[PDB]
A paper describes a structure:
The crystal structures of [name] [name] in the presence of TF antigen, lactose, [name] or GM1 were determined at 2.0 Å, 2.0 Å, 1.9 Å and 1.8 Å, respectively. [name] also binds to two TF derivatives, [name] and GM1, with Kd of 65 µM and 57 µM, respectively. Electron density maps show that TF antigen, [name] and GM1 in the complexes are all well ordered and carbohydrate rings of TFs are in the chair conformations. In the structures of [name] [name] complexed with [name] or GM1, the Arg186-water-Glu165-water motif-based hydrogen bond network involving in the recognition with GalNAc moiety of TF disaccharide is very conservative. The structures of [name] [name] complexed with TF antigen and its derivatives show a unique binding mode based on the Glu-water-Arg-water motif for TF-recongnition as observed in the mushroom antitumor galectin AAL. The structural comparisons and sequence alignments show that the unique TF-binding mode observed in [name] [name]-TF complex should be commonly adopted in TF-binding galectins, either as endogenous or exogenous ones.
Galectins are a family of lectins, which is characterized by the affinity for recognizing β-galactoside-containing oligosaccharides through the evolutionarily conserved carbohydrate recognition domain ([name]). [name] is a 31 kDa chimera-type galectin. It is composed of unusual tandem repeats at the N-terminus and [name] domain at the C-terminus. The molecule used in this study is a truncated [name] domain of [name], which will be called as [name] [name] here after.
Residue numbers in the entry: 116 to 250
The structure:
Amino acid sequence: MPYNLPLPGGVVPRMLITILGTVKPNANRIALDFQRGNDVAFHFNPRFNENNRRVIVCNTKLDNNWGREERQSVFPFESGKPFKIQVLVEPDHFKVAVNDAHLLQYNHRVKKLNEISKLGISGDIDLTSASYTMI
Ligand SMILES: CC(=O)N[C@H]1[C@@H](Oc2ccc([N+](=O)[O-])cc2)O[C@H](CO)[C@H](O)[C@@H]1O[C@@H]1O[C@H](CO)[C@H](O)[C@H](O)[C@H]1O
Ligand SMILES: CC(=O)N[C@H]1[C@@H](Oc2ccc([N+](=O)[O-])cc2)O[C@H](CO)[C@H](O)[C@@H]1O[C@@H]1O[C@H](CO)[C@H](O)[C@H](O)[C@H]1O
């Protein structure tokens, strides 16, 4: 099962979200879901073993349909190891860093950031903490 991080004032530039945890043994997937109503503004989905390969899929869900995926092979997650995911919100994109190192960028497709009221956290991880602050 997952956990939901409420974002009362919605997503706003300068917001920094930090997810601390440990990847479960023989992990299959991890998923962060920034939601706007029934839409998923930003889906960050590390897939550990998809067709015998590790890949990170990012996408947006609108009107119950997923859009064009953005993929990358660099994969900084390992089963059973501690991890830290840091997401910085900029006016133009979500900046994702893993273990204090830039990982990727995802340009905003859903533009009304103020409406993105929560962040779903799911997958094969044990959560230590999931919080946010403004920097
Ligand atoms: C392993 C494989 O041949 N994957 C194909 C396949 O993927 C699926 C997945 C689910 C279902 N289904 O629930 O019915 C059918 C097929 O078909 C896809 C297109 O329909 C892709 O061709 C997929 O290959 C993967 O495509 C992605 C990009 O979409 C990427 O290129 C992957 O590297 C590639 O394996
Ligand atoms: C089951 C699976 O492999 N889902 C993939 C797949 O989806 C399909 C759906 C239908 C067919 N088909 O009828 O031949 C092929 C493949 O490929 C999609 C991309 O082309 C997605 O990768 C889909 O997985 C879904 O991806 C979205 C993000 O794009 C999100 O991660 C969903 O949770 C995930 O199921």
